[PDB]
Amino acid sequence: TGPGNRPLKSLSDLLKGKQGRFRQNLLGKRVDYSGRSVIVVGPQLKLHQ
Amino acid sequence: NSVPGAPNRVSFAKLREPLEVPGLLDVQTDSFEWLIGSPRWRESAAERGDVNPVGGLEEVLYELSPIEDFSGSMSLSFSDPRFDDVKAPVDECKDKDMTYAAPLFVTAEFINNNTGEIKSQTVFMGDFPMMTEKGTFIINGTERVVVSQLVRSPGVYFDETIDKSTDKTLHSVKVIPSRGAWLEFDVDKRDTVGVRIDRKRRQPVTVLLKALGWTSEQIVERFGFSEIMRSTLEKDNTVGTDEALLDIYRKLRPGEPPTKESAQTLLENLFFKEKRYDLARVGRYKVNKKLGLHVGEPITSSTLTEEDVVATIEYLVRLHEGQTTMTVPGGVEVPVETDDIDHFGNRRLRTVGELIQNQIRVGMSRMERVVRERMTTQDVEAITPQTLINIRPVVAAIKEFFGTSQLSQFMDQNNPLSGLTHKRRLSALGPGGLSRERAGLEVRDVHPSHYGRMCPIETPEGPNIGLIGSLSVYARVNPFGFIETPYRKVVDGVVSDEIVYLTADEEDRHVVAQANSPIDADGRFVEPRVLVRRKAGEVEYVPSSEVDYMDVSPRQMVSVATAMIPFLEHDDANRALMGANMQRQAVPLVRSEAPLVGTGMELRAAIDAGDVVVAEESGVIEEVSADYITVMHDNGTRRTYRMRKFARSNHGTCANQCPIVDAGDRVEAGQVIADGPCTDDGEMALGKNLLVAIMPWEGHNYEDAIILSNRLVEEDVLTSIHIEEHEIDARDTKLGAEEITRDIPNISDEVLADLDERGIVRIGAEVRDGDILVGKVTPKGETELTPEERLLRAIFGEKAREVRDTSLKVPHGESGKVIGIRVFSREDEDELPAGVNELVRVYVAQKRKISDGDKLAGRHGNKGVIGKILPVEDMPFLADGTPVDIILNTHGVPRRMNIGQILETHLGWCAHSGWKVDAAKGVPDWAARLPDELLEAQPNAIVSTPVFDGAQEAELQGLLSCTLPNRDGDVLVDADGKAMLFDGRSGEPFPYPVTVGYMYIMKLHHLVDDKIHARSTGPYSMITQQPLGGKAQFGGQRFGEMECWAMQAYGAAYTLQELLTIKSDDTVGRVKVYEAIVKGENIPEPGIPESFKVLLKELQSLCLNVEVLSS
Amino acid sequence: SEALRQARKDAELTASA
Ligand SMILES: C/C=C/C/C=C(\C)[C@H](O)CC/C(C)=C/C=C(C)/C(O)=C1/C(=O)C=C([C@H](C)CC/C=C/NC(=O)OC)OC1=O
Secondary structure, three states: OOOOOOOOOOHHHHOOOOOOOOOOOOOOOOOOOOEEOOOOOOOOOOOOO | OOOOOOOOOEEOOOOOOOOOOOOOOHHHHHHHHHHHOOHHHHHHHHOOOOOOOOOHHHHHHHHHOOEEOOOOOOEEEOOOOEEOOOOOOHHHHHHHOOOOEEOEEEEEEEEOOOOOOEEEEEEEOOOEEOOOOOOOEEEOOEEEEEOEEEEEOOOOOEEEOOEOOOOEOOEEEEOOOOOOOOEEOOEOOOOOEOOOEOOOOOOOHHHHHHHOOOOHHHHHHHOOOOHHHHHHHHOOOOOOHHHHHHHHHHHHOOOOOOOOOHHHHHHHHHHHOOOOOOOOHHHHHHHHHHHOOOOOOOOOOOOOOHHHHHHHHHHHHHHOOOOOEEOOOOOOOEEOOOOOOOOOOOEEEEOHHHHHHHHHHHHHHHHHHHHHHHHHHOOOOOOOHHHHOOOHHHHHHHHHHHOOOOOEEEOOOOOHHHHHHHOOEEEOEOOOOEOOOOOOHHHHOOOHHHOOOEOOOOOOOOOOOOOEEEEOOOOOEOOOOOEOEOOEEEEOOEEEEEEOOEOHHHHHHOOEEOOOOOEOOOOOEOOOEEOEEOOOOOEOOEEOOOOOEEOOOOOOOOOOHHHHOOOHHHOOHHHHHHHHHHHOOEOOEOOOEOOOOOOOHHHHHHHHHOOOEEEOOOEEEEEEOOOOEEEEEOOOOEEOOOOOOOOOOOOOEOOOOEEOOOOOOEEOOOEEEEEOOOEEOOEEOOEEEEEEEOOOOOOOOOOOOEEEEHHHHHHOOOEEOEEEEEEEEEEEEOOEEOEEOOOOOOOOOHHHOOEOOOOOEOOOOOOEOOOEEEOEEEEOOOOOOOHHHHHHHHHHOOOOOOEEEOOEEOOOOOEOOEEEEEEEEOOOOOOOOOOEEEEEEEEEEOOEEOOOOOEEEOOOOOEEEEEEEEOOOOOOEOOOOOEOOEEOOOOHHHHHOOOHHHHHHHHHHHHHHOOEOOOOOOOOHHHOOOOOOOOEOOOOOOEEOOOOOOOOHHHHHHHHHOOOOOOOOOOOOOOOOOOOOEOOOOOOEOOOOOOEEEEEEEEEOOOOOOOOEEOOOOOOOOOOOOOOOOOOOOOOOOOOOOHHHHHHHHOOOHHHHHHHHHOOOOHHHHHHHHHHHHHOOOOOOOOOOHHHHHHHHHHHHOOOOOOOOOO | OHHHHHHHHHHHHHHOO
């Protein structure tokens, strides 16, 4: 127990994958060196561009 | 009409509704005032009976008083929950961040039962928050919104799931009370009783009856036709009351010695001692009403009665008997039938004051269980309730409720519309409410009782559909948490004119046809065979004698936002809901023009919207200003009205208020005086009115791709204001006190230019991302310098300045002037949090032009991103040289089922054009029943249509036939709504006429800059080694499971390895690669991952022999 | 009569730990 109505976490719970009885989404580390944005058409552009 | 500043918008009302719009905010006002118990509410509830007007607080007093020791030697009591005035004005409370509240005084009294002496005090219960006049609350200056949560009430709940394995209906009941225990009267597979109770696993009814003081004689007497009853009483296999009592006691406390007095002294406490087993008063009401038991008396005594249980059993057995209705002795016959958890008749509504009282009860519980604690430990004949009182837990609960609650949420003020929409919101998830996955999909469904009560259209389209909606417009609330709905009762083939606020249950009793009915001008009707809603929610041609209630009006099943899309009955609910939820995402432009076309909603919406200042008293104007207006009340008295100008919303949008009148003017009470942001001429305004064609042009309008002329840009027609606030504190470290100043560590001078004299920058200065905001500094401590740095200092004569440079710089992608500086200082006696001494907050605005990529959408769900900002000249345009505004793609129209936008476009062209229908040879037939003075139209006059009462296409065609020329002899559009156009690029006319017209559109709160973001290298983790995610900081994009497995599919491995090593975990390798890039050299090899080794150590420390073998 | 299945289960939840 502690304060804050909320359970505990052994070493067993620090397991990254730790899939028990269900194969949830995976959700690893969110790498680097990208950029996001909304997308738009390039109708003037070539295919490879 | 019926509005003073109502700008003349003609509409197409073919009907006439008796009642007008209600007070949309009453949903919150009334709950709040009742919880208050204000005399407003006092007369209010008194208007419809309500012999005992009791406030929720009064209820809490009566449910708490008296307060007495278990010995019963001494007695405490309360009285007069009395509010004190608020400690500060709402504006001041918001600005200085003091939560707008007010004290609480109670006439509490203690008396010693031993001898009897009054201890009356008027106790400060605590400062108590006060609702806004916009029905909201300000916490610490912050502005939240409470939500009303849907819950099916506690009640006697019936069902017979047929055991198909037995092929037998299994009638059952679960009477779930508040603060109580459960119980089942089950139709077992055998001809027996499912008398499992309080989660016990099983009982015979006979055990209850003899336990209830009933002989088998008494039972068969009371239950002669009771077949399973007689069977079980033959199989009761136990005789005598106390035998049943002891069996119950042992099976209830198994692992416990049975005692005889616990026979009555447990069950009566379990189910009749109304101190630990108490469904709500509304629960008792539902009980009697379902059962007609307490027919003519007010509700009380949440404890049960054997009367209740026996009527229960009788109805249950008869339901599993073949029955229609049974009148209990003392009760009218209730129709024998099941129950529904989904149907509103069980699904009540915990209101705001409801939840507040719940918190009050839970706090006062703890407080009384400590008062009774001290009640003995307190010294006798020397205490006072002041000595007895602790308001700390109660105030704690209050605070932790206003803050720290998914029902106490931030008012999304992006515009008056969505502000309103946030209120009047309906959700069943929450504390007590079901969580997300625990609810079955069926609760998301649209039960036919929903009709006219909860608009089936408006709801979040994410993974919460069906979980949250809003109210129908003309809906109204039961004091018991139900939907009391007005209805037009018809009598004798003649609709009366008496509005009838009805719930859903009684509705099932009755017969309601449709408002769109051929009424014979008098309540009399036209045809016999009439549509009508069935008690099963079904429709037929009733012969026109049978109905007793007609619809109050059309659109009684619409939401607010849903009430604001013309032609709505022509397009699919899908794009409908899409545009609906989007329309709350509108963004207030700076010009705020009103649409040519609309509904009747656009004015009432604002007049409840509030943010548009309303004329309080009728009067002549005194003097105006850009910031306020002096108002001459008609007799002497006067007043000002402080315009809110450039007030930062909860989303960076401006909140100006411009006045709309003159100081020599004279207006009337309840009248518009100054539009708010999205308000134009008093009514709503969420965009502009634009002429568009629909061709596929150059592919640039490909798959929702949306093109734009430069003309709007250079005309500022799409122009947003944004208000980003920055704040930083003056803490104090072990190294000393944080410092703010122009004095800096190593830094340029020009970078120290636009600061003030004492750190912070100067008002009105332009800025750009990374620039310095505030010159702040703290000591860093002491470490041995590098010999190199020491050398640079030596050659350069440069001091140490161990105080570290900790200033405020603007984050990325930000610019615009700084309007106002908000500064706080502990030295100034500014109250600040501990470990702080000075606070400053900054306000920058940037007049964002419209730009490509941003998301626009009409009022149809028809939406999309900005394809490309094209110049004006290179544009398809009229024969009058008038360029088009934008172009949409036809191909999205059919498959989306959104012809209403086409309707709107034709209508808007007609509206801009103006007509004058030649009623020279009588009237053209389509115009026959059409309202007069539509026979012409001044160009660019404003009009509107009721949702279900809109113009017909034939009407529109007859209009479009009448399309008087603009300036010259100029019928620019055919009778088919198309026209010939010219490519500003080609030079030629296009081969065909083209659909065109004026459409009103919005701008969404999803600007490009809000989303655009990239990154190479930034601040690495603390737990892991990893440079921070989150676009608030840099952040970036997570390359996880989908395109890994993918890259493997491609077969390319090295890129994946590089990503997962040198962009993921290799501490040394990261700087290595950075070096290699800086030097222009071949990449180093990917080192070992870090989380790998971390997991390795973990597995080790799990007491696990672990090891790799290289060979 | 067949309701006793909880009896085997109810015994093990309680004295548990
Ligand atoms: C030392 C290993 C002991 C046994 C493994 C245990 C206990 C783990 O519990 C399961 C393996 C695992 C998950 C560890 C996660 C770690 C070390 C970590 O922090 C991550 C992470 O969370 C995600 C990733 C990648 C992005 C996962 C990509 C998977 C691709 N799979 C595939 O290519 O399909 C064939 O790497 C990590 O090092």
